[PDB]
Symmetry: D2
Subunit: 142 residues, 4 copies
């Protein structure tokens, strides 16, 4: 809703932000438009793996929530549902501390699938990882 600043498209949500994975690791959406969205997270141990680096899953999740929610922002009101269907994240350079900043750019908005390219950077602006997200858009059963 606003806990992590996610899009307010519903009156009630099944799980409260603070309690979700997102709330737990502290993902926060910064900008959000139909074609582009941004989010970030402060690196803490909760975001890392045992070796001291940001967990690969963390980048995937950030990209996942971002691209999906960005789709949700537009289609919800149109009676649709949006869920992640494919997430392909590639790791270029590890992140040990600071933040992870994600930028999602929409590259295709089909009737059934939206596609977003997500770039994940470190505090120095280096490209640490990228995620190609494919979002399925379907009519709500609800």
């Amino acid at each position: 809703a606003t806990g992590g600043n996610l899009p307010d498209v519903a009156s009630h949500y099944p799980v409260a932000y603070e309690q979700t994975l997102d709330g737990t690791v502290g993902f926060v959406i910064d900008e959000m438009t139909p074609e582009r969205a941004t989010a970030s997270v402060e690196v803490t141990d909760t975001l890392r793996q045992r070796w001291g680096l940001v967990h690969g899953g963390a980048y995937c999740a950030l990209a996942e929530m971002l691209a999906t929610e960005a789709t949700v922002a537009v289609v919800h009101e149109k009676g649709m549902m949006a869920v992640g269907q494919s997430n392909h994240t590639s790791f270029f350079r590890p992140v040990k501390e600071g933040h992870v900043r994600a930028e999602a750019v929409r590259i295709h908005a089909g009737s059934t699938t939206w596609f977003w390219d997500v770039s994940l950077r470190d505090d120095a602006g280096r490209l640490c990882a990228v995620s190609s997200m494919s979002i399925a858009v379907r009519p709500r059963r609800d």
Copy 2:
């Protein structure tokens, strides 16, 4: 804690504090060619819509495939890290557990590849992850 491979004397982050320990991932079996892990679904593993977070599946696969590689290569002076993770989602999971099984399909000198299958309590294939693990010589 998570039953991760014990390959070193000290780890920078304690299990309980890692993302793995936070969501509750636990390794069940581990061999050079195959490994398994699972996690109980809690809200910590879900997104606001009540379903298991796509990131959760990615994370499980990533840790499982990477650690299964570390298990073999660590003792050989090598480091193993995730290079690519491609997860595809077939059916959501609302509660119960997520169980992963990683099958090694290629063990190259510089890259290992694992196919990970993620299933629900009914044994249904909910998602798959194709994991590419980079293997490199440890730096001083």
Copy 3:
């Protein structure tokens, strides 16, 4: 139809097998069931790149045609259309000569998307490449 032994689901096809990319490089389907299909191709220069190895695109194409056609075999008659939506091929070992043998195993058959894992092997049975194929199934406009 049978030129490359593709599934006979229509009376007429827009392009004749021998003239398509498939016919050109010589892809031939061997077995074909709803859950699993196989195909092969003899390596010739037409399948290679300038460095003398089987072109990465060749593996992608073989996987692509196979997984799609295998879906087509079942859904066509059901009034659907099937096209490749995502193809992720990973290369483990190059192939210089002989054949490339592909085996597609269906792992998920949703209402809108089917997913097949394709393994591409050399004459010695080695796993040279794999392709994760996502096939979109939609109702024919035709």
Copy 4:
């Protein structure tokens, strides 16, 4: 022929005989960080249903990203080969041309990554390919 980088005295397969030369791929621009190529749609590039073969897009991207890497690294004693190719299809192409543009996003010591965009004659994004290129020291 295809305007591929001239980096060596002899090539095992002549351009015209390769898959590239057979379908008609031609490199247009090439720099270390970006390259372009295109091809005229012919039946040789299509599948039986009359659309450009998904494999055609994969192939174009693969050759373009790989050769753009070879262009830089060959002279450095390295070999470049495709390691992973992930192509996603957004809109089919029935005739005309397919134009590709490869943008380098990471140039690591062992892996280079390129984003390839494939467009039709109307400039519409028909498909994308995420190419991972392995860079290794040449073998004797």
